[PDB]
Amino acid sequence: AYDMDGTGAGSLEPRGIKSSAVEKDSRCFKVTFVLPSQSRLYTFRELQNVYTTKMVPFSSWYAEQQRIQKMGGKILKVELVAGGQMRSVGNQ
Amino acid sequence: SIVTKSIVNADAEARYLSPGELDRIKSFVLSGQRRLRIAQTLTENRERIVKQGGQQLFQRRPDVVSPGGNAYGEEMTATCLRDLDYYLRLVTYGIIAGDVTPIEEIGLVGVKEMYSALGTPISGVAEGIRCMKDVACSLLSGEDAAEVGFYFDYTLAAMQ
Amino acid sequence: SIVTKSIVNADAEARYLSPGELDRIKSFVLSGQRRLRIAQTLTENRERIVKQGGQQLFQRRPDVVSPGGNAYGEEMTATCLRDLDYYLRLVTYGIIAGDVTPIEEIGLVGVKEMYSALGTPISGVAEGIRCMKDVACSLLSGEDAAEVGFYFDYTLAAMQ
Amino acid sequence: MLDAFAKVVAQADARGEFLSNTQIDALSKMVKEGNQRLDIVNKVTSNASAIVTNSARALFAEQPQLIQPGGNAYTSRRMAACLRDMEIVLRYVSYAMIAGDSSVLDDRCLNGLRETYQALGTPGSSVAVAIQKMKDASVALANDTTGTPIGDCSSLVAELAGYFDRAAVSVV
Amino acid sequence: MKTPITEAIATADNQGRFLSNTELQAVNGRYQRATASLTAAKALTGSAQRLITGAAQAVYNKFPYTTQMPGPAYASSAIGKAKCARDIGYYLRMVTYCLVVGGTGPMDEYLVAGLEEINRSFDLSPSWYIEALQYIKNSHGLSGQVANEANAYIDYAINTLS
Amino acid sequence: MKTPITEAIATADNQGRFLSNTELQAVNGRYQRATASLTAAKALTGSAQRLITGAAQAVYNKFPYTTQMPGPAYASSAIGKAKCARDIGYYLRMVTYCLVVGGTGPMDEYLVAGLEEINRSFDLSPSWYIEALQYIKNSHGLSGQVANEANAYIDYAINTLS
Amino acid sequence: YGFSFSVLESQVKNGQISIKEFVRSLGKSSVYQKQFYQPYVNSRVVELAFRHFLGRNLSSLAEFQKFFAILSKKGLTGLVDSLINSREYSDYFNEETV
Amino acid sequence: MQDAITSVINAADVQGKYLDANSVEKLRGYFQTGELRVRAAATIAANAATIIKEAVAKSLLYSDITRPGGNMYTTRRYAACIRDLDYYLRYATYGMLAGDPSILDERVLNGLKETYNSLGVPIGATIQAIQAMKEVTGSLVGSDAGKEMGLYFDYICSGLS
Amino acid sequence: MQDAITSVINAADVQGKYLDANSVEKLRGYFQTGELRVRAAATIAANAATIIKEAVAKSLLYSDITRPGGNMYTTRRYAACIRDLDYYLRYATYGMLAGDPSILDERVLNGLKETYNSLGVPIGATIQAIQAMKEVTGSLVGSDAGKEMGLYFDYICSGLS
Amino acid sequence: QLAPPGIPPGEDARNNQSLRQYVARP
Amino acid sequence: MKSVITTVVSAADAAGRFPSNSDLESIQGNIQRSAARLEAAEKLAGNHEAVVKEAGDACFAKYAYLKNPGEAGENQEKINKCYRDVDHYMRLVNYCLVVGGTGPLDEWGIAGAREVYRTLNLPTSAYVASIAYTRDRLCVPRDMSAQAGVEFSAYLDYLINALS
Ligand SMILES: C=CC1=C(C)[C@@H](Cc2[nH]c(/C=C3N=C(/C=C4\NC(=O)[C@H](C)[C@H]4CC)C(C)=C\3CCC(=O)O)c(CCC(=O)O)c2C)NC1=O
Ligand SMILES: C=CC1=C(C)[C@@H](Cc2[nH]c(/C=C3N=C(/C=C4\NC(=O)[C@H](C)[C@H]4CC)C(C)=C\3CCC(=O)O)c(CCC(=O)O)c2C)NC1=O
Ligand SMILES: C=CC1=C(C)[C@@H](Cc2[nH]c(/C=C3N=C(/C=C4\NC(=O)[C@H](C)[C@H]4CC)C(C)=C\3CCC(=O)O)c(CCC(=O)O)c2C)NC1=O
Ligand SMILES: C=CC1=C(C)[C@@H](Cc2[nH]c(/C=C3N=C(/C=C4\NC(=O)[C@H](C)[C@H]4CC)C(C)=C\3CCC(=O)O)c(CCC(=O)O)c2C)NC1=O
Ligand SMILES: C=CC1=C(C)[C@@H](Cc2[nH]c(/C=C3N=C(/C=C4\NC(=O)[C@H](C)[C@H]4CC)C(C)=C\3CCC(=O)O)c(CCC(=O)O)c2C)NC1=O
Ligand SMILES: CCC1=C(C)/C(=C/C2=NC(=C\c3[nH]c(/C=C4\NC(=O)[C@H](C)[C@H]4CC)c(C)c3CCC(=O)O)/C(CCC(=O)O)=C2C)NC1=O
Ligand SMILES: CCC1=C(C)/C(=C/C2=NC(=C\c3[nH]c(/C=C4\NC(=O)[C@H](C)[C@H]4CC)c(C)c3CCC(=O)O)/C(CCC(=O)O)=C2C)NC1=O
Ligand SMILES: CCC1=C(C)/C(=C/C2=NC(=C\c3[nH]c(/C=C4\NC(=O)[C@H](C)[C@H]4CC)c(C)c3CCC(=O)O)/C(CCC(=O)O)=C2C)NC1=O
Ligand SMILES: CCC1=C(C)/C(=C/C2=NC(=C\c3[nH]c(/C=C4\NC(=O)[C@H](C)[C@H]4CC)c(C)c3CCC(=O)O)/C(CCC(=O)O)=C2C)NC1=O
Ligand SMILES: CCC1=C(C)/C(=C/C2=NC(=C\c3[nH]c(/C=C4\NC(=O)[C@H](C)[C@H]4CC)c(C)c3CCC(=O)O)/C(CCC(=O)O)=C2C)NC1=O
Ligand SMILES: CCC1=C(C)/C(=C/C2=NC(=C\c3[nH]c(/C=C4\NC(=O)[C@H](C)[C@H]4CC)c(C)c3CCC(=O)O)/C(CCC(=O)O)=C2C)NC1=O
Ligand SMILES: CCC1=C(C)/C(=C/C2=NC(=C\c3[nH]c(/C=C4\NC(=O)[C@H](C)[C@H]4CC)c(C)c3CCC(=O)O)/C(CCC(=O)O)=C2C)NC1=O
């Protein structure tokens, strides 16, 4: 279901990205960032634009924001376009 | 509620609501008169449902209240009953919403992280909700006790 | 049916069924007595529901039966009514299954590929099902006509 | 048997009180409803044969064990007595709708009807299904226009549903 | 239950008296007639499916509209054709019950009492059942006093429908 | 005869008292509704032959066996056709009598008392007379409360036939 | 089969979401899980995920157990989000290349 | 994404209090109209294609956005419209059932007027299409149900403006 | 993935005929037990962890698969068991509601015995765990409900054998 | 429910009976 | 907007008085009469495209000479404008039933109409053939209620009395 079942350290599925997203979450951000690949010079793949602006969901913004810095990216701006704040029920 | 997730179900599928979805929103709102009566019973029985709820909880789990238990002393025992007042409140929300969606994103999502991080035995708080369930279903008829008890055991399932 | 996709919904989410899902499987099976009566009405009225169904279809779309129409002659007109007997049968399945899941994977998924590949005007067969709907809802009360008509218009929606 | 107007007077006389001005205006708006109440009673008696014979036909389709040999509604006399009880209950519910009070319905239709069906062995839960099938067959026939002017009859149809529910819990 | 046995008991019990020879003679006439009655009850039973399926076809050949009209009251679908042959087997089963008992008692309570309220409500026509009972009279294939005992309870049913 | 006037007299004469305001209001309501009922009866009278020829033809279209089958009960010959347009005119005339009087009185005394006995004897079907009455309910051309008064007595006769 | 994701072709043709967003939403769709999730086992679902959202087969045994336990605990919506949010997706395809 | 019950529970929860008489008073008001909304959402599902065909033919069918140079000329651009109008008639149906317009701005309104300005879609003709679509929707569901479904159409038109 | 209603509709559809008296006769039989299955699936959802804790302690807790060298020694291997037993108690709950074991072989049974042989998982101890898990499940849901839930456990045990 | 047996509903005689002279209905 | 409010707050404002009991009583009539006149505002709105279609062709069935060249309805565009104008007059009658008086007719349709119909050479008798056909197509308890047919007709022949 959601990503906070009871998993933490020392648990059977591997220790990973745990987001505070509810059941079928409907909140999503509008993020903007550059993310240079830092791996094209030994792989020699084709080049793709690294400056992107896209709507990521609340269910997986934290994983994406945690990963964009993994590969040296810089986050220029993020906002919560869709969803409420301090909302107990209704994020579903 | 059943209205909001029957929508977001058909929302994701790029379609409207089927008869299977619209004959149940219909069936739920005619059920709404009976739901408020059930939640009205638990609303002003929280004095007995909570206090007798913590009654059986300490008789079944004296460790948590004994010296060394998490709810030891005048202080923690008050908060020991405070959480039961919380979860008894969320069950009143689930009965009126016709689903554990209110109980889902309040008191259930990531609950093991909180209680593990508070040092509280999560199995102990599960025992507390079960003791409240026998008090709650003892206050209602058989047709209602299949509902009010029905939301407690979901909270029991997610709390372990 | 409502039972099988309420399961596969909660199946994918790694969880059991909520009260919102189990109070509707419960609500559907008590509805099962009334569903078989409704499907029993359409079962042995297919002689009139189909033949009067193709009645208004040709009066509203004489092109399809005129010389050059897809259902021209003694042959195609018989198959012209055969498809209406199919779709009238699937509506009896959807009423008993409480959902268009039987109608979904039979007669709806990829239906435009078939009728486009047969040369049949897909809008014409949509007109045929609408003519059957007025005959079907004329055979039942208002409480039932909100269901039997309810499955036809879903078939109308997916068929265009 | 007393109607909705005499129910107010019967309560005021046991207090020894005149009717106050907020009680007369609650009775002057029952007169204002008026024609809408007689339109409901006209619509459920003009179709009174069709309400019973359709709800009966829809009751043995859902419960086919009633008309099997050994069922409670298998013979000519036991089938005719089944359609008879539904016409009696529908008759007294329309008496309570024109009165505005369920007094005539439980005075002389519902007193001892539960203990009658226990004596005969009639399944009283299946009799309640038949009252509910007559309920929505006449609720749906109350709120269709078909010769009436357009307006709000929502509180009177909710009142008519209450008499059908009172008869359906006083039978099992 | 109109039996010759129970009409004798009810005659003596109306005046609070024992069974005299007025009553023992009435139940003597049941026993003399019971030989011909019990042989008709076996013959109508043993050829029941031939008579039920034959008489259901006899209604469709005289009233062809009952297999063509749309509605729940007619035998145009397979549901209505199954409820038609159910009724013909109800009429034949009552006739063999009367031949076993001796009098027109089983079909009075089980068949005739309440019947015209049913045909008026469910829009069933009693001329269909007269035509079906006319077939069983002409085709049970019996003779003698065995046939006269069987034809009397068939003609008793025709007079109630007419 | 059942009338709002005579039912007020009969409920006071049964109790043995003078006509109070309980009874003066039941005949006041008969006088308010009398203007709608008398326009509904003048229109059904002046278009009677159109409604009689049309309603009889509306039965021969739904039930075409009634113009086919031999026998005295059916409208096959010209004699059975003349006895059918006479039966429709009896049902229509009792409706205009009930509108004039103000209640279901003339069709109780003259038509529906004994109606199920003369239908079963002469082998007439009540479904023939229902379809003849559904035509008049759909073809009188009345509007509003004038049609509410006419369709209230048409719907009353359909309930006794069914 | 005349299928349609008009909302997703909307939000990708305008550039409101990436191809990676359009691919992830396709994975959590119900026309997908009816196709490649319901008829199979969680074991077989993991390998069929790699052929679709990564363009390659599983590599090792530990790469199975990491991704089986995720699907074991979060189902389809937890598995496809754990592939689309990996680094190996981003190195080959970030936001624009199918 | 909150319905009327979710919004009532949120406001009653956000103060930490139980559902008092005022919170349940609105909830009873929503359950009374629960029967009206389903039948309103019933017929709208049936006549979805017919309503959109009626709106475009009544508002912007023959105007010069339809002709060459207008904003709706090419078949891809015309086909995007009825795809686009389908969401307005669909999401408005969701707001009519949920009894709360939170789903509209959550999933429709945000980034919408900022998107049409990017594409150059005329907001003026868009609102009149929705207004005409609101006019036909009051035809089907009736007066009060049209008042309910119409209450979310102009919510889209207001924010999209 | 078919329930009892889906299987009844399929067989009645596969011959192209309507739902006759025999097809509806079984459907009425399924609707009669609809009330029993939900309450059976209700309590099983509540006592999911308790049932699995009871089965392993009653069947294979102290056997030498639990000790070193046994098939369940390491904590990863022990933790895989209760994860693995959770599916059997969960999918059996789905079969109990759907009234048809098609979901089991569709999503559990296929490639299962062929997988345990690969890992070297003892099929003998697995079935006895499910048998013990079937025994405790009859405790909670009652006799006839245990007969229903038990009817799908041995279906897993039969095919897994 | 209803009235008790025989009692015409609405014409009860114990409506505004005083408590000091009230007699319990058998 | 000549209405029931804007006569009692236009005469009180010219007098310089507060709304007294003579002016609160006038809006009590706006609660009893408006139960009927909004029903004729609702039936006319839900069936407007069939009323003008049934009414606008009676302009051309009676006067068939309009399709002659040189006359008013001579081509395609001028026929569509002639059906447009009867939709306008049927829209202001829907606006006048929901206002309460003849406000949207006396300001928006009537005032200046005798100067545009003479300048553009439109026959104003052709307009009242379409409106008086709509008054006589009105079945009183079938179209609407008995009272709502009074309110809808009394704005219709007021519009006829304005154009003639
Ligand atoms: C003796 C025979 C007799 C009757 C059978 C009734 C029927 C009846 N009802 C109304 C009058 C009415 N009837 C209704 C009723 C309804 N409107 C609806 O939309 C619902 C479908 C239905 C509710 C049941 C309403 C709302 C009015 C008020 C008229 C209006 O405001 O338009 C009138 C006319 C009153 C008038 O306009 O002056 C009559 C005669 N009254 C009688 O005297
Ligand atoms: C001199 C002192 C004196 C009194 C105090 C009353 C005491 C009293 N109350 C009631 C009677 C009653 N008392 C109540 C009381 C209540 N209703 C509720 O729902 C709450 C429990 C509570 C309001 C605060 C009710 C409902 C009845 C009616 C019982 C019935 O008719 O079934 C009766 C029976 C007779 C009757 O019908 O009135 C009597 C004797 N009478 C007296 O003469
Ligand atoms: C010609 C002059 C004229 C008036 C002065 C008003 C008079 C008036 N007020 C109300 C009636 C009312 N008035 C109020 C208003 C209030 N109550 C409160 O507690 C608040 C202090 C205040 C709110 C501002 C309420 C709540 C009602 C009852 C509900 C209602 O009828 O709307 C009623 C209906 C009930 C009745 O019959 O009395 C009338 C006629 N109407 C008129 O036609
Ligand atoms: C909002 C205002 C409004 C109205 C005034 C009516 C007006 C009206 N009635 C009819 C249509 C009709 N109107 C009538 C009624 C009658 N025919 C007569 O000659 C009698 C005078 C009267 C009996 C009461 C009939 C019988 C029809 C159908 C056949 C016909 O066109 O005459 C039509 C043509 C479209 C249709 O078929 O409905 C129109 C516009 N409808 C509306 O929406
Ligand atoms: C506010 C309310 C309102 C109205 C009442 C109308 C009134 C009106 N009509 C026309 C304009 C017109 N009106 C007509 C109408 C008719 N000629 C005929 O053939 C028939 C006799 C008749 C219709 C049945 C025609 C043909 C024109 C165009 C005149 C022209 O082009 O010469 C114009 C000039 C501008 C234009 O529309 O082109 C105006 C103001 N318009 C409004 O906005
Ligand atoms: C590694 C660097 C890094 C950080 C720090 C980070 C933070 C971060 N904190 C979040 C939420 C949150 N953070 C909090 C925190 C708090 N509430 C309080 O009252 C306190 C003041 C505070 C705790 C100290 C809460 C309550 C949420 C949930 C908000 C919501 O559900 O709306 C979220 C949203 C998604 C999620 O949690 O799954 C992110 C991404 N991400 C990162 O990559
Ligand atoms: C259960 C879902 C389902 C459907 C609907 C279905 C349709 C179907 N329609 C067919 C033919 C046909 N269908 C039509 C139909 C029509 N002509 C018209 O004018 C009308 C618009 C329309 C009918 C209302 C005609 C004319 C043919 C024969 C075409 C030919 O011979 O080339 C055929 C080929 C012949 C056959 O095997 O029957 C199939 C398979 N099969 C299915 O399994
Ligand atoms: C106060 C007004 C009043 C009522 C309402 C009333 C009912 C009443 N219903 C009866 C029987 C009956 N009632 C039913 C009705 C049903 N059984 C079923 O299976 C169905 C579920 C249901 C209706 C469809 C049947 C079948 C009988 C006959 C029982 C028998 O003869 O054994 C009897 C037994 C006498 C008889 O045969 O007529 C009475 C007295 N009596 C009254 O005085
Ligand atoms: C043991 C004594 C007994 C008798 C006599 C009896 C008759 C009987 N026949 C009935 C219906 C029926 N009877 C028929 C029979 C026919 N319709 C035709 O067109 C054919 C010509 C004809 C066959 C000869 C049909 C089609 C129905 C169904 C009518 C309906 O359900 O509306 C019904 C209505 C309730 C039901 O469906 O069971 C009764 C009570 N029931 C009894 O318990
Ligand atoms: C004023 C109250 C009143 C009523 C209701 C009434 C009915 C009535 N209709 C009769 C006959 C009849 N009724 C019909 C009518 C029909 N048969 C058909 O085929 C058609 C479908 C249908 C007409 C539409 C026929 C043909 C007869 C002659 C039957 C016979 O002579 O056996 C008879 C037999 C006596 C006679 O020969 O005149 C009576 C008493 N008589 C009355 O005085
Ligand atoms: C669910 C909330 C939501 C909305 C509303 C939405 C709109 C949206 N409308 C679009 C285009 C468009 N929209 C229109 C619409 C119109 N042209 C006109 O003249 C009219 C005024 C109007 C119809 C009412 C057209 C023509 C395009 C194509 C533009 C182009 O190809 O440049 C696009 C570009 C991509 C695509 O259509 O695939 C998006 C994303 N997306 C969303 O997620
Ligand atoms: C939903 C249908 C389904 C099933 C049943 C399933 C089973 C399954 N069981 C596994 C392992 C395992 N299963 C067990 C189980 C046991 N050891 C014992 O002694 C007992 C007899 C038994 C417990 C009852 C163990 C110990 C492993 C780990 C094996 C290893 O690490 O080598 C694995 C390897 C990957 C992993 O666990 O992450 C799969 C895929 N997969 C499915 O999709």
mmCIF file of C-alpha atoms in Angstrom, chain D residues 30-156:
data_model
loop_
_atom_site.group_PDB
_atom_site.id
_atom_site.type_symbol
_atom_site.label_atom_id
_atom_site.label_comp_id
_atom_site.label_asym_id
_atom_site.label_seq_id
_atom_site.Cartn_x
_atom_site.Cartn_y
_atom_site.Cartn_z
ATOM 1 C CA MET D 30 -51.092 21.550 5.993
ATOM 2 C CA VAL D 31 -54.117 23.079 4.273
ATOM 3 C CA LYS D 32 -51.724 24.838 1.889
ATOM 4 C CA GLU D 33 -50.138 21.503 0.960
ATOM 5 C CA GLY D 34 -53.656 20.280 0.437
ATOM 6 C CA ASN D 35 -54.167 19.539 -3.230
ATOM 7 C CA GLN D 36 -50.697 17.962 -3.364
ATOM 8 C CA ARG D 37 -51.767 15.390 -0.779
ATOM 9 C CA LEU D 38 -54.885 14.450 -2.739
ATOM 10 C CA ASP D 39 -52.790 14.117 -5.891
ATOM 11 C CA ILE D 40 -50.677 11.457 -4.151
ATOM 12 C CA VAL D 41 -53.723 9.503 -2.931
ATOM 13 C CA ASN D 42 -55.277 9.717 -6.403
ATOM 14 C CA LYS D 43 -52.139 8.285 -8.003
ATOM 15 C CA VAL D 44 -51.724 5.284 -5.694
ATOM 16 C CA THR D 45 -55.366 4.196 -5.916
ATOM 17 C CA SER D 46 -55.755 4.626 -9.674
ATOM 18 C CA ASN D 47 -52.870 2.183 -10.125
ATOM 19 C CA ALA D 48 -53.617 0.067 -7.053
ATOM 20 C CA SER D 49 -54.101 -3.148 -9.009
ATOM 21 C CA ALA D 50 -50.842 -2.650 -10.903
ATOM 22 C CA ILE D 51 -48.831 -1.964 -7.733
ATOM 23 C CA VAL D 52 -49.837 -5.281 -6.181
ATOM 24 C CA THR D 53 -49.622 -7.572 -9.201
ATOM 25 C CA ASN D 54 -46.214 -6.257 -10.319
ATOM 26 C CA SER D 55 -44.647 -6.389 -6.870
ATOM 27 C CA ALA D 56 -45.985 -9.910 -6.431
ATOM 28 C CA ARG D 57 -44.591 -10.991 -9.811
ATOM 29 C CA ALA D 58 -41.232 -9.509 -8.774
ATOM 30 C CA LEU D 59 -41.298 -11.267 -5.392
ATOM 31 C CA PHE D 60 -41.547 -14.860 -6.625
ATOM 32 C CA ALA D 61 -38.861 -14.163 -9.202
ATOM 33 C CA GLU D 62 -36.371 -13.266 -6.475
ATOM 34 C CA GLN D 63 -37.676 -15.940 -4.068
ATOM 35 C CA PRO D 64 -38.766 -18.889 -6.236
ATOM 36 C CA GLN D 65 -39.031 -21.179 -3.197
ATOM 37 C CA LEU D 66 -42.333 -19.559 -2.204
ATOM 38 C CA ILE D 67 -44.212 -21.050 -5.169
ATOM 39 C CA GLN D 68 -42.578 -24.461 -5.213
ATOM 40 C CA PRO D 69 -44.628 -27.349 -3.810
ATOM 41 C CA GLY D 70 -44.053 -26.931 -0.103
ATOM 42 C CA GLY D 71 -43.767 -23.149 -0.267
ATOM 43 C CA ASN D 72 -46.086 -20.817 1.560
ATOM 44 C CA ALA D 73 -47.683 -19.400 -1.561
ATOM 45 C CA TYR D 74 -48.263 -22.589 -3.513
ATOM 46 C CA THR D 75 -51.914 -23.297 -4.251
ATOM 47 C CA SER D 76 -54.731 -21.248 -5.696
ATOM 48 C CA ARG D 77 -56.054 -20.199 -2.281
ATOM 49 C CA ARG D 78 -52.625 -19.546 -0.784
ATOM 50 C CA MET D 79 -51.653 -17.445 -3.777
ATOM 51 C CA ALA D 80 -54.883 -15.434 -3.660
ATOM 52 C CA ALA D 81 -54.443 -14.872 0.077
ATOM 53 C CA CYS D 82 -50.960 -13.531 -0.646
ATOM 54 C CA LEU D 83 -52.278 -10.935 -3.094
ATOM 55 C CA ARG D 84 -55.112 -10.205 -0.661
ATOM 56 C CA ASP D 85 -52.864 -9.154 2.235
ATOM 57 C CA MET D 86 -50.907 -6.806 -0.016
ATOM 58 C CA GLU D 87 -54.097 -5.036 -1.098
ATOM 59 C CA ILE D 88 -55.200 -4.633 2.522
ATOM 60 C CA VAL D 89 -51.887 -3.085 3.599
ATOM 61 C CA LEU D 90 -51.884 -0.822 0.540
ATOM 62 C CA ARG D 91 -55.481 0.179 1.330
ATOM 63 C CA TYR D 92 -54.738 1.219 4.906
ATOM 64 C CA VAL D 93 -51.521 3.032 3.958
ATOM 65 C CA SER D 94 -53.539 5.245 1.614
ATOM 66 C CA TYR D 95 -55.940 5.847 4.513
ATOM 67 C CA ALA D 96 -53.029 7.118 6.595
ATOM 68 C CA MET D 97 -51.806 9.280 3.717
ATOM 69 C CA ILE D 98 -55.113 11.116 3.332
ATOM 70 C CA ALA D 99 -55.335 11.491 7.120
ATOM 71 C CA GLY D 100 -51.789 12.656 7.735
ATOM 72 C CA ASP D 101 -51.557 10.225 10.632
ATOM 73 C CA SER D 102 -50.757 6.527 10.940
ATOM 74 C CA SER D 103 -53.484 6.006 13.544
ATOM 75 C CA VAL D 104 -55.934 4.135 11.312
ATOM 76 C CA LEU D 105 -53.128 1.992 9.894
ATOM 77 C CA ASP D 106 -52.041 0.495 13.205
ATOM 78 C CA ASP D 107 -55.471 0.544 14.865
ATOM 79 C CA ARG D 108 -57.082 -1.879 12.442
ATOM 80 C CA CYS D 109 -54.457 -3.262 10.131
ATOM 81 C CA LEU D 110 -51.268 -3.898 12.110
ATOM 82 C CA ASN D 111 -52.543 -4.972 15.560
ATOM 83 C CA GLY D 112 -51.795 -8.673 15.763
ATOM 84 C CA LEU D 113 -50.571 -9.061 12.193
ATOM 85 C CA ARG D 114 -47.157 -10.182 13.428
ATOM 86 C CA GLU D 115 -48.661 -12.877 15.663
ATOM 87 C CA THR D 116 -51.003 -13.986 12.870
ATOM 88 C CA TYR D 117 -48.114 -14.762 10.533
ATOM 89 C CA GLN D 118 -46.286 -16.647 13.286
ATOM 90 C CA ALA D 119 -49.361 -18.809 13.860
ATOM 91 C CA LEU D 120 -49.785 -19.659 10.182
ATOM 92 C CA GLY D 121 -46.071 -20.160 9.630
ATOM 93 C CA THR D 122 -45.864 -17.419 7.023
ATOM 94 C CA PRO D 123 -42.307 -16.052 6.661
ATOM 95 C CA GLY D 124 -42.710 -12.502 7.934
ATOM 96 C CA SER D 125 -39.369 -11.404 6.506
ATOM 97 C CA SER D 126 -40.665 -12.176 3.015
ATOM 98 C CA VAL D 127 -43.853 -10.245 3.738
ATOM 99 C CA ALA D 128 -41.673 -7.236 4.561
ATOM 100 C CA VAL D 129 -39.932 -7.590 1.176
ATOM 101 C CA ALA D 130 -43.357 -7.326 -0.463
ATOM 102 C CA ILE D 131 -44.226 -4.143 1.459
ATOM 103 C CA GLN D 132 -40.941 -2.568 0.358
ATOM 104 C CA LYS D 133 -41.606 -3.559 -3.252
ATOM 105 C CA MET D 134 -44.979 -1.826 -3.031
ATOM 106 C CA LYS D 135 -43.277 1.155 -1.388
ATOM 107 C CA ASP D 136 -40.961 2.145 -4.220
ATOM 108 C CA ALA D 137 -43.528 1.175 -6.852
ATOM 109 C CA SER D 138 -45.772 3.901 -5.402
ATOM 110 C CA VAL D 139 -43.032 6.333 -4.391
ATOM 111 C CA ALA D 140 -41.887 6.380 -8.025
ATOM 112 C CA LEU D 141 -45.503 6.827 -9.105
ATOM 113 C CA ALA D 142 -46.000 9.759 -6.739
ATOM 114 C CA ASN D 143 -43.174 11.931 -8.075
ATOM 115 C CA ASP D 144 -43.883 11.840 -11.771
ATOM 116 C CA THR D 145 -45.628 14.863 -13.243
ATOM 117 C CA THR D 146 -48.056 13.320 -15.801
ATOM 118 C CA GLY D 147 -50.907 15.800 -15.536
ATOM 119 C CA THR D 148 -49.825 17.602 -12.372
ATOM 120 C CA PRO D 149 -48.262 21.080 -12.278
ATOM 121 C CA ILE D 150 -44.567 21.267 -11.497
ATOM 122 C CA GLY D 151 -43.621 21.685 -7.869
ATOM 123 C CA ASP D 152 -42.064 20.238 -4.748
ATOM 124 C CA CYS D 153 -43.747 17.211 -3.173
ATOM 125 C CA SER D 154 -40.612 16.001 -1.399
ATOM 126 C CA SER D 155 -41.851 16.151 2.194
ATOM 127 C CA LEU D 156 -45.095 14.337 1.388
#
